[PDB]
Amino acid sequence: ASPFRLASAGEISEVQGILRTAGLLGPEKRIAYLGVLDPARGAGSEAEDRRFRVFIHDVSGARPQEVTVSVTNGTVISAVELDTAATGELPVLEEEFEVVEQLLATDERWLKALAARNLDVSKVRVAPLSAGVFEYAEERGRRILRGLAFVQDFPEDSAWAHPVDGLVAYVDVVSKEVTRVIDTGVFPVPAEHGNYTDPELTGPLRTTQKPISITQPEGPSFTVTGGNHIEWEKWSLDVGFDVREGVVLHNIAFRDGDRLRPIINRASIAEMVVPYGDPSPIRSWQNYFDTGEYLVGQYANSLELGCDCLGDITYLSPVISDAFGNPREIRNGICMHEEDWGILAKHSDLWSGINYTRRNRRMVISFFTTIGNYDYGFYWYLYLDGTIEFEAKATGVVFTSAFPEGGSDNISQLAPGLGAPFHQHIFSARLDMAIDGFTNRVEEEDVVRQTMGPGNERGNAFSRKRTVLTRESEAVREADARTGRTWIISNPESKNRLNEPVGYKLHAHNQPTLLADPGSSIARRAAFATKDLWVTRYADDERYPTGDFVNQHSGGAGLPSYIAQDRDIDGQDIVVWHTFGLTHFPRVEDWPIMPVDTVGFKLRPEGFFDRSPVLDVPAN
Amino acid sequence: ASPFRLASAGEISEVQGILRTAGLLGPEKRIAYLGVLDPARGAGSEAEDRRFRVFIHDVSGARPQEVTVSVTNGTVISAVELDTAATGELPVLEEEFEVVEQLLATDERWLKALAARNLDVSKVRVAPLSAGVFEYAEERGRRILRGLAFVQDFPEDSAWAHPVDGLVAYVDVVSKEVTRVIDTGVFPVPAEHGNYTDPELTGPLRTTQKPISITQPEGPSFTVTGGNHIEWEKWSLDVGFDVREGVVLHNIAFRDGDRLRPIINRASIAEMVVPYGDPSPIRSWQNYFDTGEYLVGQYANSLELGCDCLGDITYLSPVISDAFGNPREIRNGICMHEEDWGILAKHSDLWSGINYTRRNRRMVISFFTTIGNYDYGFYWYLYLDGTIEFEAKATGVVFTSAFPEGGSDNISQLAPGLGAPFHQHIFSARLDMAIDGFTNRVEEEDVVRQTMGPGNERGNAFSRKRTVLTRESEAVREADARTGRTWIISNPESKNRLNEPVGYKLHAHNQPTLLADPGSSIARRAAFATKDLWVTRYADDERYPTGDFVNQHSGGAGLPSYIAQDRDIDGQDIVVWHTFGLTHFPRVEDWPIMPVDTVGFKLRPEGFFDRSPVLDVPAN
Ligand SMILES: O=CCc1ccccc1
Ligand SMILES: O=CCc1ccccc1
Ligand SMILES: [Cu+2]
Ligand SMILES: [Cu+2]
Ligand code: NA
Ligand code: NA
Ligand code: NA
């Protein structure tokens, strides 16, 4: 019944049939993206219409198409041919991952480079890296991937330990031509292996860890209805899944007494970018948008009970399309469980004699994705007290290079001859806000220091100030940790019992934003990453901070184009875009496989409730 | 055997006997502090000498004394009479908590103030607040407490809901005189109760929470020997307890292969301060040092299994002295347990076919203290991967006032007529470092942005810089979140296999430091709180960032006095002092009892190991 239910295998099969019948899915066609569209604003009409958006690539060189279909009515709503030199190329296809290595293996220039290094071509893996846009005029409007080489000594070897530095190739994957092979000189291929399951490297495994058993003898406290509707400890929401964004949260609301109170209409990680800070021409082009260019949702892992998710786990298995429109299940792709979270509130009172302790808990919704060397866990958390938190967990294997003789200012050494270039991991959270409804506004809150003097004779006073952001042109904001800067999303037409607007406060981690020079190609294509906070007026087609077609787009699409409309955001239907990231100078302890590091943000109620919302939590 | 074992009841009884026999513990004497001294540097002599430091107060007006005794030899080592106008008053005594209310109850000025407000004196509780040092010349060298009044409607009522604003009294607790009663006008006493166990306020308790069962069927993975020596997953350390500081960690080391490698010699929270930002003369003097003035360790709670600590818990019950030198056990005052901590490392490799997942865990050492309205949990965490983290959890009841008609810039409204003044909670962690031994140094690490140009033609490069702090006069440092500033403690004489100095990196939360005007009394007495990081040369007598006698000390003691010695800290025995805190603008959801908020810091290895230290963790 619910318009926010997960896509079914039958829906995807119908999309395939509709596309085929319309002549849109011949043997040269590939589906590069397929996803269900959200209901438009004002769906109080009970007009069930499940629509899907599709990007269709053509492997023969014909122009790709963007298509919208209605599975409910079985019709093509619209179909548009794309000029990719103008609006950007389509996302990378999984089946192209191997084409770069295959094409290079028969190119005489590539072969001469490997021969000089005495590398057997059958042992050389080539990473299929997105190209970006730089100085090469012949790449405009062509579908280009760039290749960096790694040696695998045997089939189970970790190739990342053996980078082939000084060598890069560019490939046109549609015409199947190697456009350029650049060899800047021979570097020794690092010889130590990085096989973290080899007993030679691990030593004997610890025998000292005793088991931790986490069980729920009466089952979990949350309920799942209609496939993906969650109710837990007054929270209510729908868990969506999109092949580009991954897990998406819809309709986050909190039952406060008799009223279901909305908080967030849609929450997602709408983009992420990993820019590299090595000026070597072998890697100075390297910036990959895992979300926008590769689609992190299609690489979600199947999560193992006891290993990836521990406790009383409820799984969702989302369905996606393969490149031919067949449905493919991601078995156990989403874990949901509740976790004990320590003390919630505690007081022992010297005058009343009352001793009081309550325990906290959180609801966890997570998935894990793998794109080449990197692996990321995406975690959404709901707490008893109304807090919402997001956490990204970065692990996997660092991207490697040679470590130059005589050192480097932009690479750290991990092992003899083995380097790891400096880089960042930057995310964009898109928060379609609905604090008690859609009439919302954003205020910037700074601590205010006061001078000793009249009215402050002992010099102890301090205060705060709030600035309302009223138009999009003034809603591009930077962090300021020193002044305790936060942002408050409030509803000016909904007041608490003290006659103050209800609100939620966004707490950032205040990590550095994009470091690249403002005139760089990556600063233009990832402009969202240069600022901590953006606020836009809601619009149906404004989905990603980088635009719809990120791959090889020349820049400026997305947020800098949206805010140029300078729309009213003071008590309106608004969207918050928060940039947050990790700056990674790799350490020896990150090698051969990296222990998890984390970054995120959280939102806490700020006069949303009339008092603490967890007074009715029992003593356990 | 171990010199770092907890104080025993027999040791304290011997101290009492030694003091009594020496004429130092007559009926007018009170022990205001008693604690075991750490071994001096270079204890490779096996010279067991358990020494205790004692502060002795005199309730008749005689000068107090500082005394050092040896329980091993049964002798007084030294005894010094204190001039408190010079060096500060002794910490507040528990038995003085009730003396302020008792003395005010017979003062005619206090009675007239209560009579005008129609308050029955038997219902009026008076909080015993530390005085600080302000403009009152007659307080110099006298033991002063200040009193703020709260009404209790019945014995089990929460008095915090009913502040009596406009009224403050100053009391000399030794001569038993009320020096001043200040009445600036009548405010309505807020009428709503704040009884968070009253069903009228809580409503019916939730029935929706199902149990979470955390068990260890084979017991915990750590061992406790000699009372307080912990070994867990290659970590080794001693858990101490001091009545001023609370839990103290000694001898933190990590077994790396065959070598036990030191990391931190002593870790503690050596001070905390709560400054209030309300300029009203009723409260503009209000700054309490829970650690330095009240001694947070003596108010540690007995922790309840299943409620405060959940899982397979091992308790310590530390012993302290009461005011007469009798030993008193704090039953179950420290919880120790290990916790699952999610994913540790994970990778699924497209070329090797290997799928790899390992789970993380942490060791938890915690205690909870209550001082009047506020309650704090102190948590130390050790992780599998070498990370050390501290976390403070703040809960309890916010300090209240009236909310003035017409609002306030320095107070938030919680309920009709009820306010909560702005304030901070600021902590000082004292880290006596020993990274691979005592030859340590500190470097400040900033991200370095680079300009597009020659050698950086695509404008993508970024780097980092490290600045060695060589003398104490240059080792007072501020946070800079925008440039990703961290601090590295390294050993220049101990290198990893890449011939780089081994190190640990301190990651701060970058919260605002002390907001008060630099010319204020609190800025002088809590000078440590004005800067994020201090580094000193180790010295036996340099224990607290505020000095030994914080109560009514006029300022400048502690860290600003230590660093004036301008000692060499470049490859020396050094101590890191990190200031971190919360800035609290109270929200409606903080009332009537506050959900936990947190702040802390962490240290991660930085080239300390030759590769990831958790390769030998098994697959579970
Ligand atoms: O994360 C996307 C870049 C990438 C893709 C495939 C292999 C290595 C790196
Ligand atoms: O936290 C120390 C200040 C204090 C002490 C006792 C009651 C209320 C407040
Ligand atoms: Cu990284
Ligand atoms: Cu507070
Ligand atoms: Na273009
Ligand atoms: Na909105
Ligand atoms: Na003095």
Ligand code: NA
């Ligand atoms: Na030291």
